[PDB]
Design a binder for this molecule. Structure first.
Ligand code: NAD
Ligand code: UPG
Ligand code: NA
Ligand code: NA
Length: 338
C-alpha cells in the first residue's frame, strides 16, 4: 500500500517504517526533524531492505500535505508526528495544542482534500485519565488528562471521531500506546532523546552507560507491590508490528477502531531497573526521590481487543526490551550522527 508516515524519522515511526518496508509497502516519511535527524534514514533503509521516500516538512502545512498526498497516491496515513514532552507541555501549552491539535487538523483537512480516508493515530493511555479501574479497557469512557499534552491527544481523538461520523467512509484507528521501550534488535536503531531523558528506560540506559550518576525513583510510597510506580512496558518492535497489521487489516474498513497497545502486564520501577541491571551486567545505580507531579500509581493495558480483532499481541519480553535498549545505547552512545 502507499503509506504516509508522518514523524516517520522519529522514535516509534522509524521502527514502524522498517517493518512496513519489510512487508513491501511503499513508504513516504514526512518529518520536520525537530526531534529527529536525517542520519536515521539510511538505517531505516538498510534495516527495511527497501528505500523509503523522505520529505522534510511540517504537518501544519496544509498545502504541502495535500500535495504530498496527491503526488504520492497515498492510500493510508500513519500519524506519529507531534510533541510529547509532558513536562514541557505544562510550561509551553500553546505549542502543544498547535503541533498536536492543529497539526492533526491540518493533516486530516488535507486528507479530505486529496480524497484520503484511511488513518492511524498515535494516541495514549493517558486519555483514560485517573481511572481507578485497571487494566484499562477501550469501552471505558475517557477521563481528563493532567497535562496539555494529554489533553491535545484526547481532543484529537474527539475531532477524529467527529470527522469519521460526518464522513463515514473513513477508516480511523485510535492506537492508544502504553509505555514503549526498547530498540531494533540490530542495536543500530533506538530511541535517541536529546538532553535529559524524561522516560524511565532512556534514563536508565543513560545511567548505565555512565553519563548519569543515579536514577531517581519518583516515589516509594505508592499502593503497589514494591511501592514504586507500575506501567505496561511494550517493546517498540511489537508496537511497530501492530501498526503494520492495523494498517493492513483496517484499510477501507469504515469506522473508528480503538485499540490499546500494550503487553497487558504491569511492571514496577524496580522491576525495570532489575531487568536493565541484569542485561548490562552490573548494578544500576538509583535512589528514591519524591513523587513526580501528575504520576498515577499503576495501570496497564487490557489488550484483548487487538488480539481478537487484529490477531495481534506482544511477542517480546521485558528482558529483551532492556537488552535491546542496552545494545543500542552501548553500540551508539552518541546516538545518531550529526
Ligand atoms: N514514546 C512514548 O512514550 C509515547 C507514548 C504514547 C504516545 N506516543 C506518541 O507517538 C508519536 C511518536 O512518538 P515518539 O517516541 O516516536 O516521538 P518522537 O519525538 O521520537 O517522534 C516525533 C517525530 O515527529 C517529528 N515532528 C514533531 N512535530 C512535527 C510536526 N509538527 N511536523 C512534522 N514533524 C514533526 C519529530 O522530529 C520526530 O521525528 C507521538 O505522537 C507521541 O505522542 C509515544
Ligand atoms: O527518571 C524517571 C522516570 C520515570 N520514573 C517512573 O517510571 C514510570 C514510567 O514513567 P515514564 O517513562 O516517564 O512514563 P509515563 O509517565 O508513564 O508516560 C509516557 O507514556 C505515557 C502513556 O503511558 C504517555 O502519556 C507519554 O507520551 C509517555 O512519555 C512512572 O511511574 C515514573 O514515575 C521514575 O521513577 N524515574
Ligand atoms: Na510555568
Ligand atoms: Na528529552
Amino acid at each position: 500500500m502507499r503509506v504516509l508516515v508522518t514523524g516517520g524519522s522519529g522514535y516509534i515511526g522509524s521502527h514502524t517504517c522498517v517493518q512496513l518496508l519489510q512487508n513491501g509497502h511503499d513508504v513516504i516519511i514526512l518529518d520536520n526533524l525537530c526531534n529527529s535527524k536525517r542520519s536515521v534514514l539510511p538505517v531505516i533503509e538498510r534495516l527495511g531492505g527497501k528505500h523509503p521516500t523522505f520529505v522534510e516538512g511540517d504537518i501544519r502545512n496544509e498545502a504541502l500535505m495535500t500535495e504530498i498526498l496527491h503526488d504520492h497516491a497515498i492510500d493510508t496515513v500513519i500519524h506519529f508526528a507531534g510533541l510529547k514532552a509532558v513536562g514541557e507541555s505544562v510550561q509551553k501549552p500553546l505549542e502543544y495544542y498547535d503541533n498536536n491539535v492543529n497539526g492533526t487538523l491540518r493533516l486530516i483537512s488535507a486528507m479530505r482534500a486529496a480524497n484520503v480516508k484511511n488513518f492511524i493515530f498515535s494516541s495514549t493511555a493517558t486519555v483514560y485519565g485517573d481511572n481507578p479501574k485497571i487494566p484499562y479497557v477501550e469501552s471505558f469512557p475517557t477521563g481528563t488528562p493532567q497535562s496539555p499534552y494529554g489533553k491535545s491527544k484526547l481532543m484529537v481523538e474527539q475531532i477524529l471521531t467527529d470527522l469519521q461520523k460526518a464522513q463515514p467512509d473513513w477508516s480511523i484507528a485510535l492506537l492508544r500506546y502504553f509505555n514503549p521501550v526498547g530498540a531494533h534488535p540490530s542495536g543500530d536503531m533506538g530511541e535517541d532523546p536529546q538532553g535529559i531523558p524524561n522516560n524511565l528506560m532512556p534514563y536508565i540506559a543513560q545511567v548505565a552507560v555512565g553519563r548519569r550518576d543515579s536514577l531517581a525513583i519518583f516515589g516509594n510510597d505508592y499502593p503497589t507491590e514494591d511501592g514504586t510506580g507500575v506501567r505496561d512496558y511494550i517493546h517498540v518492535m511489537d508496537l511497530a508490528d501492530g501498526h503494520v497489521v492495523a494498517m493492513e487489516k483496517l484499510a477501507n474498513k469504515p469506522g473508528v477502531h480503538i485499540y490499546n497497545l500494550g503487553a497487558g502486564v504491569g511492571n514496577s520501577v524496580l522491576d525495570v531497573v532489575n531487568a536493565f541491571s541484569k542485561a548490562c551486567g552490573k548494578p544500576v545505580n538509583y535512589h528514591f526521590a519524591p513523587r513526580r507531579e501528575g504520576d498515577l500509581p499503576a495501570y496497564w493495558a487490557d489488550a484483548s481487543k487487538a488480539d481478537r480483532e487484529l490477531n495481534w499481541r506482544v511477542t517480546r519480553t521485558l528482558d529483551e526490551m532492556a537488552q535491546d535498549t542496552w545494545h543500542w545505547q552501548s553500540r551508539h552512545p552518541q546516538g545518531y550522527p550529526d
